[PDB]
């Protein structure tokens, strides 16, 4: 299983198309203050991987968390992650929807910031890694075996929507 403690991510927005699918993190146990769901775990660490179609007894868009390109002036969804121990991070696998006909496309680029201590600022040197198939592909993001305890991954926008369903990590606990 993913040895993650908590993750910070903006609140899931709603796509109002035909019947209006809700793309919110319904299983988020943490508290959502302002425009951030910080200090908790939800749909991005539940083991359940999203289906090829986000619409498919629950409301349409239950197994997904979304964000629109127009609602982010920065152009990226700043997602933070907190871990229990100082681990060496090999790679991050995220299952995103690639439905081009409804705007939900894979991110154009993902850069991550690393830090070992909770009080110190992000070390630096981000690991940035960069279509017709409309199937949900598990995006492989190489983290270069860097030893860190907290992450700050920014998911760039390529399509009008970014629909993540599950975020997994590959790491070994360093002594």
């Amino acid at each position, epitope marked *: 299983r993913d040895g993650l403690l908590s993750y910070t991510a903006p609140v899931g927005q709603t796509m109002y198309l035909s019947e209006a699918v809700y793309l919110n993190d319904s299983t988020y146990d943490g508290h959502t203050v*302002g*425009g951030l769901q910080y200090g908790g775990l939800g749909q991005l660490a539940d083991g359940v991987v999203g289906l090829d179609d986000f619409r498919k007894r629950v409301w349409p868009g239950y197994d997904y968390v979304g964000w*629109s390109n127009h609602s982010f*002036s*920065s152009g990226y969804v700043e997602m933070e992650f907190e871990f229990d121990r100082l681990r060496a991070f090999q790679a991050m696998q995220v299952h995103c929807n690639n439905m081009h006909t409804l705007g939900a496309r894979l991110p154009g680029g993902v850069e991550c910031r690393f830090r070992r201590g909770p009080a110190m600022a992000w070390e630096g040197e981000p690991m940035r890694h960069n279509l017709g198939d409309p199937r949900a592909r598990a995006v492989s993001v190489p983290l270069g075996g860097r030893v860190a305890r907290f992450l700050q991954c920014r998911f760039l926008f390529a399509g009008p929507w970014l629909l993540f369903s599950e975020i997994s990590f590959i790491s070994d606990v360093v002594n």
Partner: antibody, heavy 118, light 107 residues
């Protein structure tokens, strides 16, 4: 009970620099500044993404710096160069998401009238 | 970048259905806000997103639109509804404001 009271309300001379202070009683949200000239409508001035600023405005490209102080829990707005046409009531917005995830400020400030004349 | 609200004023009596249009300079997303502002007072949030309403705000305030064309229909105009309205596209960052449709009572 959450409040947003700004310590402004000062008359300044054309060219002078006045700084406003949006103190927040009851704190770290996506903060904005919106002005309203007497008779005129509302025009958004700028925004700050938790300690890291985000583009102010097409007109406010020059001057208008939005500083933030977590130790004093107050937003600071330095206007630097000023013209007589910049007289308006200055409010500080607090953007909070609704039940659908989308943003929209729910709590507004009190407003402080700034007059720019010689 | 530019939010062009139209018209600048609406003359209607208590009970009339009133729709306010908000035009966007670019084909923006569904995010939008509607503010009620009575004279000498601070603004009040009525709508978040497009269709979502704020707490306290009655159900007569209906939202609609997507892209550039946006609307604000009112089920039944009430004496406490007369105020200037402002549409505002508000993402996490750069959020410009609208013109201002001043709702006026008809007598």
């Amino acid at each position: 009970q959450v409040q947003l009271v700004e310590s402004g309300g000062r008359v300044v001379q054309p060219g002078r620099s006045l700084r406003l202070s949006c103190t927040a009683s009851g704190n770290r949200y996506y903060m904005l500044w919106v002005r309203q000239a007497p008779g005129k409508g509302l025009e958004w001035i700028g925004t700050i993404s938790y300690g890291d600023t985000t583009y102010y405005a097409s007109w406010a490209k020059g001057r208008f710096t939005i500083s933030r102080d977590n130790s004093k829990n107050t937003l600071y707005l330095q206007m630097n160069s000023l013209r007589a046409e910049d007289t308006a009531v200055y409010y500080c917005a607090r953007a909070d998401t609704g039940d659908n995830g989308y943003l929209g400020l729910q709590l507004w400030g009190q407003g402080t009238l700034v007059t720019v004349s010689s | 970048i530019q939010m062009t609200q139209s018209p600048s004023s609406v003359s209607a009596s208590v009970g009339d259905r009133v729709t306010i249009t908000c035009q966007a300079s670019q084909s923006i997303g569904s995010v939008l806000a509607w503010y009620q502002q009575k004279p000498g007072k601070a603004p009040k949030l009525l709508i978040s997103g497009v269709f979502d309403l704020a707490s306290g705000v009655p159900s007569r305030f209906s939202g609609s639109g997507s892209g550039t064309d946006f609307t604000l229909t009112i089920s039944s105009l009430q004496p406490e509804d007369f105020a200037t309205y402002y549409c505002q596209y508000i993402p996490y960052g750069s959020s410009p404001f609208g013109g201002g449709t001043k709702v006026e009572i008809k007598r």
